Structures are given as structure tokens and as C-alpha cells.
């Protein structure tokens, strides 16, 4: 029950939170705020 990324911060680029609807909601959620 933490909002964490599970990959490191510098790979949850602004690119994959636009486009990449695996690392929005698996491996960035924090970074792009999906928790």
C-alpha cells in the first residue's frame, strides 16, 4: 500500500507515460501518477 515506480525513476520517461499503458500502470505509477 505505497505508490512507488518498481523500475528506476530516469526509465519512466515522459514518452512511456504518454504511450505505454504497461509502464503507466505497472512499472511508473507514481511517476505518472496513476497511484
Not at 512511456?16 to 505509477?29: A, D, E, G, V
Request: hydrophobic content about 20%.
Amino acid at each position: 500500500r505505497s505508490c512507488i515506480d518498481t523500475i528506476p525513476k530516469s526509465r519512466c520517461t515522459a514518452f512511456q507515460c504518454k504511450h505505454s499503458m504497461k509502464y503507466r500502470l505497472s512499472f511508473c505509477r507514481k511517476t505518472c501518477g496513476t497511484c
